[PDB]
Curated annotation (Swiss-Prot), chains A, E:
It is found in: Mitochondrion inner membrane. It holds the Pfam family Peptidase_M16. GO terms for cellular component: mitochondrial crista; mitochondrial inner membrane; mitochondrion; respiratory chain complex III. One of its GO terms (biological process) is proteolysis. Component of the ubiquinol-cytochrome c oxidoreductase, a multisubunit transmembrane complex that is part of the mitochondrial electron transport chain which drives oxidative phosphorylation. This is Cytochrome b-c1 complex subunit 2, mitochondrial. It comes from Saccharomyces cerevisiae (strain ATCC 204508 / S288c) (Baker's yeast). Component of the ubiquinol-cytochrome c oxidoreductase (cytochrome b-c1 complex, complex III, CIII), a multisubunit enzyme composed of 10 subunits. The complex is composed of 3 respiratory subunits cytochrome b (COB), cytochrome c1 (CYT1) and Rieske protein (RIP1), 2 core protein subunits COR1 and QCR2, and 5 low-molecular weight protein subunits QCR6, QCR7, QCR8, QCR9 and QCR10. Present with 35700 molecules/cell in log phase SD medium. The modification Phosphoserine is found at S125, S152. Belongs to the peptidase M16 family. UQCRC2/QCR2 subfamily.
UniProtKB/Swiss-Prot annotation, chains B, F:
It comes from Saccharomyces cerevisiae (strain ATCC 204508 / S288c). It is a peripheral membrane protein. This is Cytochrome b-c1 complex subunit 7, mitochondrial. The keyword Membrane applies. Component of the ubiquinol-cytochrome c oxidoreductase, a multisubunit transmembrane complex that is part of the mitochondrial electron transport chain which drives oxidative phosphorylation. Present with 10100 molecules/cell in log phase SD medium. The gene is QCR7. Keywords: Electron transport, Membrane, Mitochondrion, Mitochondrion inner membrane, Respiratory chain, Transport.
From Swiss-Prot, chains C, G:
Component of the ubiquinol-cytochrome c oxidoreductase, a multisubunit transmembrane complex that is part of the mitochondrial electron transport chain which drives oxidative phosphorylation. The chain holds residues 1 to 55 of 385 of the full protein. The chain crosses the membrane at residues 28-51. Belongs to the cytochrome b family. This is Cytochrome b. It comes from the Eukaryota. Component of the ubiquinol-cytochrome c oxidoreductase (cytochrome b-c1 complex, complex III, CIII), a multisubunit enzyme composed of 10 subunits. The complex is composed of 3 respiratory subunits cytochrome b (COB), cytochrome c1 (CYT1) and Rieske protein (RIP1), 2 core protein subunits COR1 and QCR2, and 5 low-molecular weight protein subunits QCR6, QCR7, QCR8, QCR9 and QCR10. Residues 1-27 are mitochondrial matrix. It comes from Saccharomyces cerevisiae (strain ATCC 204508 / S288c).
From Swiss-Prot, chain D:
It is a peripheral membrane protein. This is Cytochrome b-c1 complex subunit 1, mitochondrial. GO terms for cellular component: mitochondrial inner membrane; mitochondrion; respiratory chain complex III. It holds the Pfam family Peptidase_M16_C.
């Protein structure tokens, strides 16, 4: 039961409850999405309506974000009302009602909406594809619920029991006094939660290389590549991502997006090329691969990536920091590739 | 009259041995004289549904019971139009005359009540 | 569609007197309305014709 | 279409086809689902399935033979396919399967597995084949409590109550020589198939005549299987039609051809010369429909089947179709009759002269079992060309105008009005 | 301008104008589909309506079918009316109107329907995938129009120009007097067509092996395998398909479908495992591949494959026959695989 | 009156040098006095559209011309309600007063007449 | 939905007199209709009142 907090003399604070139950832990496709979507619905003693109306009069709002790793219940409110929000979030984990009607009336439609929005963005279909081909069921699980695998009300409750346990979550505070936070947390229904295990793995996940998947799609075409990275090798990939997404690379204008998704047991580097016509996409992805295969870096972007990594002051437990001062060269070895869109006119991993 | 109100008064009587021994028999008599069971209907099938609370409740009712309700209703209109009653072996028995919709109705009523209170809360500064 | 449904005037006759969905079980007590319509017509027709010889 | 038939106890009938490339030999019995009871219903479909059993099929596959079995209302067939020369081996398999495997195929392992198969098979049909399930209920309500009402595949209730004893009793009463016709179609010659039959002998299960009962009767009625969870409304409606050998057999078929079939999704189908199309395409009353003139031994059914997603205009679909039918009695035009003649010929052509030997076997057998010999197209075409507008009107005046109807439907049929409203449209007002 | 026919004393005849314009020849995804859906529409001298109304009075119907190889304009009618139908088919190839309003009012809606029906059946999706991974632009072209690649009216007219030529077609008559058929074809506009160049490749197409692609789908799951076959090696794959489907193989009740698509330059053996639940599709294909690795056949299915293959009465251009009288064994080397449906719970190629 | 009929008559006159020189000057004057061009309309914009032919013709009209037709109409209604004409330089010019919809109307009519002929074909044995 | 559109009676008033979509360019000649309605009401009301003193 971890509890951290960084104080300040501000008017607003922000409570967070990081639960290790993102898509990577989903026993069934989309079950993590549905649970995340179920958060803040009725609890056995307070209704979703009561919660909203009450928190509004206080001056605070809630939200539950889903990650590939976490399910984060977060609250933003006027500093002095801390215990209220500590308990509200506590009640969500300990006694969410899970009424059959809430699933059909609020949850399913919201997830249907989340999916609908994402379904129109090909880079997200590619990101899902990348994870799937390199981690065949680990973090490779679909991020959202799409109905290809039916999830019953019971499956969602089961997953709630599997993930909502003391040893599997981290309570975090911002502009909050750590003394009271720990006090209020122990004083809440958090401490009463059964302390299960913690599927947070230490051993590096099994990965795959040389894999490719193609999906026909109407709209923009997108060619992307994925690369599994070590728990130690992720330092150079962090600068690689920034280098390619900065003015230092004469090919940053050739790529839509590039980043390094970090986890405690490794990470995944992803680079996407997106454009209206397949011909433009093809040229870029080829020019990107060739220039990276003929590897080059020399770290002229070590100070830059050092700044960009710092402009992420929210993770009260982010990965390796000083690992930047090390390694400077880079050469594109093996990787994974996906083609979304005008597939019949996109490059195959074969010709890359 | 709200079912919450009916239940409040009914539970009170049902818990009281004195009132319960006095009223329930009269109520049992009333229900048999009512005759809806002879038409094959359960009491909950008789509740006027043209109001938001009942529409909410009927929406939430599980598929299988909903199909069952529909049958009892259709079968009843047919029986009534022929001016007959159903054969005894098709009459709803007391054991079967269960308040299947009631819990959904009480739930819907409580939610609307809270929503009404919250819509009209006063603030004390 | 049928002329009785597409025509501006007939569609009114159709909706109120022809295709109008009636509960399968309404008894004879529901015949009183049509009877009141007959009464009104009877009253009006006879009244007008008498009106022609009244002072 | 050319026949050749001889007898010596066992009646043999063939139809050579020099451009066949294969040949089919088999036996067809003059008993189908209409010869079953409401409680042993499905026993024929059961026989069909054990004949096509996995074991039995392997024994034929090694021999270069393909098996086929069709269960209908009046007849039943078991056919074997092979190359033109391997015909001698097909008769051996037939003789082996129906004059030796009286307990081979009826083993506890083979039976219980087959029973289990046809059970899931029928459960699926009843669960998903809406247009055929509806058409089957049409026969069920039209000829209720009569031979023709029983579904060819049988009901799940009687299917799961069947035992080997039921299969045997049916075989003992129907798989008889007097109720069968050995059929040979493909390229093989007649005066060659009979030899291989004479090569063997015996008479196991002969002399006996099949059983008799009450005749099929049409009853104006309806069966409604409403299901609001389905995306469509499937309906079938018909009047009492014509039995095979009726003087109006071809007239009734020409009448059906006049209104024909239609698929709202196929460009050419929307362009056919069927007046009804002008009334149903404005608001798109249906996805498809098809008229039919079903004919059996005792009675027939003349009508149509439709599928539609326009659940709020079903009354118009029915209204317009039945209003077109009225025309057959009072105003059908010369050109409509001439267009029907041409297309009936075309359909009779595609039916009786497909390149498929198993189709011709079933048609040959089922027909000789009734009239004694399959009808030639040349004669059929001559009867068709002789049909006049008056013939059609006289016929419609008796089978269509103000006559009882049989209805069946499933899916979103709330918009399908009551019986009387439908029955009323079978005629028009006049001075 | 090959013209063949086989007479008979019947009432009905069949006329077919095979054109090597199947999906395999499509310049853009779906143009072959659209062109097929455009046949029988208005011609510069006779409208679609007039064609139908007149042909009905005569006693015949028309139809245009799309193969992976051909576009067949068939016509069934009453024997003595042959010239009309020869001229009718001729006009289609020669003077089809291609009016803009026909593309929007008839053609596109019909193609939308074809795709809509096809999209609901997962084995058809699996089959498109097999072709797409084993080959990659000829035989691997999608069979139907799906809009991922926009096709204009012009593109349809261009493909018509490229495909409808004397050298690229065969006039097949069935139940017709060959002497007369040859006469009518020459007299018709069929011979007035610009002599082109037969698009048929004599040499075997390039192929790929050990390829895999996964497609998520709501409904029945399907695992399928595709194997490219040589021109001479196709006779054994033909009897394999009949073996695996006959009562001679214990694993026939484990496979929904299995066939060998035959082309003049090779073929593709396809085997599909379809079922409502993924657990069953997994165990089956797993058992299928495992058992096929054990090279067996012995050829007890030789006289069976001869009979089954003999049911080609309507086909007046069937491949090599004499090949069956040989080969008794079948192994199983490298192959291509596709998973459709509950992908997250279907086998990967690695584990087969 | 159909456009097929109108075109037949007008073409005869147009093909005849005698009638052409006697009739056209009259028609030019008729069109100028008509004043529709002063409101920014082309003659084809004036065709009453509440009938099957016009609807299929208007549906078949390419998007670009349809957007322009739409504008000319809206512009006309606005000008008309203000009881003014358009500024001189906004008037449709004789070269701009092109029969853009005529070919579509004629195509629809020819198709409709054929359907009418085919729906009533008589057969001679 | 606004009460004028939802109510059974007011919805008729609304579709004919309130939200009825009129062509932007109709001129004063299109004012005769309403004037004829006024005429009918003037005739009926003045007539009924005189009828009270007529023989
Ligand atoms: C002074 C001024 C008077 C003016 C009013 C005149 C009109 C009177 C209307 C009568 C009325 O509304 O009574 C309705 C009750 C309800 O009845 P229910 O439950 O719907 O019917 C079941 C039917 O038998 C079904 O049966 P049915 O098959 O429809 O035939 C019914 C019966 C109807 O007779 C009538 O005319 C109805 C009054 O026909 C006959 O068999 C009679 C043969 C002589 O009918 C009764 O019970 C009547 C007693 C009050
Ligand atoms: C006869 C006995 C019984 C009948 C009594 C009732 C009489 C009403 C019938 C008259 C009628 O309908 O006339 C219609 C014409 C057409 O007019 P228009 O083209 O649409 O108008 C453009 C407006 O000036 C715009 O201008 P405006 O901004 O709407 O003001 C208009 C004008 C309206 O005057 C009226 O009373 C309307 C007739 O107000 C004025 O500035 C002048 C006040 C005298 O109005 C005319 O000017 C007549 C032209 C011959
Ligand atoms: C709802 C319709 C009507 C009702 C209820 C009604 C009722 C009555 C009653 C009760 C009387 C006296 C009956 C008597 O004892 O003689 C009467 C008389 C009269 N009514 Fe009506 N009336 C109606 C409609 C009409 C109409 C529309 C007219 C006029 C056109 C009319 C004209 C007369 C006349 C002329 C008398 C005098 C003759 C007589 O005594 O019957 N009535 N009316
Ligand atoms: C008491 C009698 C009548 C009343 C109250 C009445 C009322 C109306 C009303 C309110 C309108 C719409 C506004 C307008 O155009 O003025 C209208 C339109 C119309 N009325 Fe009448 N009307 C009457 C008689 C007639 C007569 C006698 C004719 C023709 C013989 C007629 C022909 C029309 C037509 C054709 C329109 C549509 C005009 C258009 O929109 O271009 N009306 N009428
Ligand atoms: C709505 C159309 C109506 C029209 C066009 C109309 C027209 C007329 C005309 C032309 C006269 C003769 C006026 C004269 O020269 O004195 C008249 C008289 C009369 N009308 Fe009407 N009228 C109408 C409605 C009514 C109604 C509903 C009544 C009700 C009873 C009525 C009652 C009378 C009476 C009592 C007279 C005689 C007294 C008089 O001369 O004004 N009218 N009407
Ligand atoms: C203000 C209201 C006053 C009266 C309300 C009463 C409503 C009943 C009206 C009766 C109309 C019957 C028409 C039937 C019809 O069109 O179906 C026609 C059949 O009509 C007939 O057979 C005629 C039978 C004789 C009708 C008796 C006339 C009624 C006496 C009038 C008294 C009323 C004041 C459709 O027949 P089909 O459906 O078999 O093809
Ligand atoms: C107190 C009255 C309350 C008001 C409610 C009005 C309800 C009317 C009830 C009676 C309906 C009976 C008459 C309807 C006539 C149907 C025929 C018809 O509409 O044909 C009309 C033409 O009618 C006429 O020309 C004269 C109508 C005079 C009506 C005299 C009473 C055809 O109209 P159509 O619908 O086919 O238009 C197609 C679009 N071009
Ligand atoms: C020949 C007649 C021609 C056609 C007649 C229709 C023309 C309508 C003109 C009348 C305009 C006046 C409408 C006022 C009614 C609006 C209020 C209303 O309907 O409230 C009604 C109750 O009305 C009454 O109790 C009295 C009816 C008034 C009778 C007037 C003589 C509420 O009805 P509500 O629409 O709100 O229902 C939903 C709420 N659960
Ligand atoms: C407002 C008071 C005035 C009342 C006047 C009474 C009206 C009486 C009308 C009587 C008969 O009108 C007549 O009805 C019969 C149905 O019953 C119609 O018959 C029609 O339907 C019947 C079936 O029920 C068919 O057998 C028949 O072939 C068909 O023409 C007939 O064509 C029509 O002409």
């Amino acid at each position: 039961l971890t509890v951290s907090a960084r104080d300040a003399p501000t008017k607003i604070s922000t409570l967070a409850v990081k639960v290790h139950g993102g898509s990577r832990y989903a026993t069934k496709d989309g079950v993590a999405h549905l649970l995340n979507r179920f958060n803040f619905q009725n609890t056995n003693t307070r209704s979703a309506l009561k919660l909203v109306r009450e928190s509004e009069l206080l001056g605070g709002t809630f939200k539950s974000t889903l990650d590939r790793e976490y399910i984060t219940l977060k609250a933003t409110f006027l500093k002095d009302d801390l215990p209220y929000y500590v308990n509200a979030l506590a009640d969500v984990l300990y006694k969410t009602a899970f009424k059959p009607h809430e699933l059909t009336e609020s949850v399913l439609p919201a997830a249907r909406y989340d999916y609908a929005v994402a379904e129109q963005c090909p880079v997200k279909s590619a990101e899902d594809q990348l994870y799937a081909i390199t981690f065949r069921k680990g973090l490779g699980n679909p991020l959202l619920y799409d109905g290809v695998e039916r999830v019953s009300l019971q499956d969602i409750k089961d997953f709630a029991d599997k993930v909502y346990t003391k040893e599997n979550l981290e309570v975090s505070g911002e502009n909050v006094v750590e003394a009271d936070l720990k006090r209020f947390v122990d004083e809440s229904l958090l401490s009463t939660l059964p302390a299960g295990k913690s599927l947070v793995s230490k051993s590096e996940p099994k990965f795959f290389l040389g894999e490719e998947n193609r999906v026909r799609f109407i709209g923009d075409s997108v060619a992307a590549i994925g690369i599994p990275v070590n728990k130690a090798s992720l330092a150079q990939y962090e600068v690689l991502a920034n280098y390619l997404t900065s003015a230092l690379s004469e090919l940053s204008g050739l790529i839509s997006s590039a980043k390094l998704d970090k986890f405690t047991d490794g990470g995944l580097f992803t680079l996407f090329v997106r454009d209206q016509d397949s011909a433009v996409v093809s040229s870029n992805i080829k020019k990107i691969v060739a220039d990276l295969k003929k590897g080059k870096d020399l770290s002229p972007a070590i100070n830059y990536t050092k700044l960009k990594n710092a402009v992420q002051n929210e993770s009260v437990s982010s990965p390796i920091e000083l690992n930047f001062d090390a390694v400077k060269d880079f050469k594109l070895g093996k990787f994974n590739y996906v083609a979304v869109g005008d597939v019949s006119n996109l490059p195959y991993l074969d010709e890359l | 009259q709200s079912f919450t109100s009916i239940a409040r008064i009914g539970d009170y009587i049902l818990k009281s041995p004195v009132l319960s021994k006095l009223c329930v028999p009269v109520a049992n008599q009333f229900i048999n004289l009512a005759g809806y069971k002879k038409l094959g209907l359960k009491f909950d099938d008789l509740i006027a549904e043209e109001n938001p609370i009942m529409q909410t409740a009927l929406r939430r009712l599980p598929e299988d019971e909903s199909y069952a309700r529909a049958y009892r209703i259709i079968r009843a209109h047919q029986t009534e139009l022929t001016h007959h009653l159903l054969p005894r072996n098709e009459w709803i028995k007391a054991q079967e005359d269960v308040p299947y919709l009631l819990p959904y109705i009480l739930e819907a009523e409580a939610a609307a009540k809270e929503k009404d209170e919250l819509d009209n809360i006063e603030v004390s500064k | 569609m049928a002329f009785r449904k597409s025509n501006v005037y007939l569609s009114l006759v159709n909706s109120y007197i022809i295709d109008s969905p009636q509960p399968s079980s309404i008894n004879y007590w529901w015949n009183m309305g049509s009877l009141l319509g007959l009464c009104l017509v009877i009253q009006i027709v006879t009244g007008i014709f008498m009106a022609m010889h009244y002072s | 279409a050319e026949v050749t038939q001889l007898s010596n106890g066992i009646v043999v009938a063939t139809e050579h086809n020099p451009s066949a490339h294969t040949a089919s030999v088999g036996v067809v019995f003059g008993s189908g689902a209409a010869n079953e009871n409401p409680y042993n219903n499905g026993v024929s479909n059961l026989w069909k399935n054990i004949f096509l059993s996995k074991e039995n099929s392997a024994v034929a596959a090694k021999e270069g033979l393909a098996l086929s079995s069709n269960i209908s209302r009046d007849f039943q067939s078991y056919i074997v396919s092979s190359l033109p020369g391997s015909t001698d081996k097909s008769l051996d398999f037939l003789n082996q399967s129906f004059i030796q495997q009286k307990a081979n195929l009826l083993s506890s392992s083979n039976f219980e597995a087959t029973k289990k198969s046809v059970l899931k098979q029928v459960q699926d049909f009843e669960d998903n084949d809406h247009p055929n399930r509806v058409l089957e209920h049409l026969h069920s309500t039209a000829f209720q409590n009569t031979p023709l009402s029983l579904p060819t595949r049988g009901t799940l209730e009687s299917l799961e109550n069947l035992v080997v004893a039921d299969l045997e009793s049916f075989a003992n009463n129907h798989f008889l020589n007097s109720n069968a016709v050995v059929v040979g179609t493909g390229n093989i010659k007649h005066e060659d198939l009979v030899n291989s039959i004479e090569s063997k002998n015996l008479s196991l299960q002969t002399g006996t005549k099949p059983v008799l009962k009450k005749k099929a009767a049409f009853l104006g009625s309806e069966v409604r299987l409403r299901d609001d969870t389905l995306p469509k409304a499937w309906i079938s409606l018909a009047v009492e039609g014509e039995p095979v050998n009726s003087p109006n057999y071809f007239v009734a078929k020409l009448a059906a051809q006049i209104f024909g079939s239609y698929n709202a999704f196929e460009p050419a189908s929307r362009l056919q010369g069927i007046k009804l199309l002008d009334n149903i395409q404005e608001y798109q009353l249906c996805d498809n429909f098809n008229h039919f003139s079903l004919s059996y031994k005792d009675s027939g059914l003349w009508g149509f089947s439709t599928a539609t997603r326009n659940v709020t205009m079903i009354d118009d679909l029915i209204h317009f179709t039945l209003k077109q039918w009225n025309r057959l009695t009072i105003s059908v035009t010369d050109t409509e009759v001439e267009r029907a003649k041409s297309l009936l010929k075309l359909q009779l052509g595609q039916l009786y002269e497909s390149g498929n030997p198993v189709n011709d076997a079933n048609l040959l057998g089922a027909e000789v079992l009734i009239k004694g010999s399959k009808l030639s197209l040349g004669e059929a075409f001559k009867k068709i060309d002789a049909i006049t507008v008056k013939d059609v009107k006289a016929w419609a005046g008796k089978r269509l105008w103000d006559q009882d109807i049989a209805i069946a439907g499933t899916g979103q049929i709330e918009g399908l009005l009551d019986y009387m409203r439908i029955r009323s449209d079978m005629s028009m007002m006049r001075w």
